[PDB]
Structure 1
Amino acid sequence: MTTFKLIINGKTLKGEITIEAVDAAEAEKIFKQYANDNGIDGEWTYDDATKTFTVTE
């Protein structure tokens, strides 16, 4: 069960949409694409302690 999350730290989007992926690396890609489709572009940080990223805008 590899469900990675993503906290959005910016005016665009705001939550932790959980998604499954081969590893956190792919999750960051799925998260880094899901953000563009909405307009989320800023910073990015992965949390290996909570399996959650952090996309700022």
Structure 2
Amino acid sequence: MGTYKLILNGKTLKGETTTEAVDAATAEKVFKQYANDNGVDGEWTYDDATKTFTVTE
């Protein structure tokens, strides 16, 4: 568990969000859905060091 962070690094639109997920899969799914909702879909990365994900459109 813990608080995860998402970094939307899009060519068109960018943003950031944070959510409390039980595991990395739940985190990645919530964020995938969130990014796709913002119309962001690029190379997804992860930084366990600070529990963050970055999607580079």
Q: Same fold (TM over 0.5)?
A: yes
Aligned-pair identity (%) = 77
* TM-score w.r.t. length of structure 2: 0.84
1:33 aligned residue: 33
Corresponding residue SS for 1:44: strand
User: What RMSD in Å do the two structures reach over aligned CA positions?
Assistant: 1.3
2:46 aligned residue: 46
* TM-score w.r.t. length of structure 1: 0.84
Runs of 4+ off more than 3 Å: none
1:12 aligned residue: 13
How many corresponding residue pairs?
56
Partner amino acid, structure 2, of 1:24: A
If each structure's strand is expressed as a fraction of its own residues, which one has the higher value?
2
Unaligned runs of 5+ in 1: none
Q: Work out the CA distance in 1 between the residues paired with 2:26 and 2:46.
A: 12
1:39 is displaced (CA, Å) by 0.4
1:24 aligned residue: 24
1:26 is displaced (CA, Å) by 1.1
Unaligned runs of 5+ in 2: none
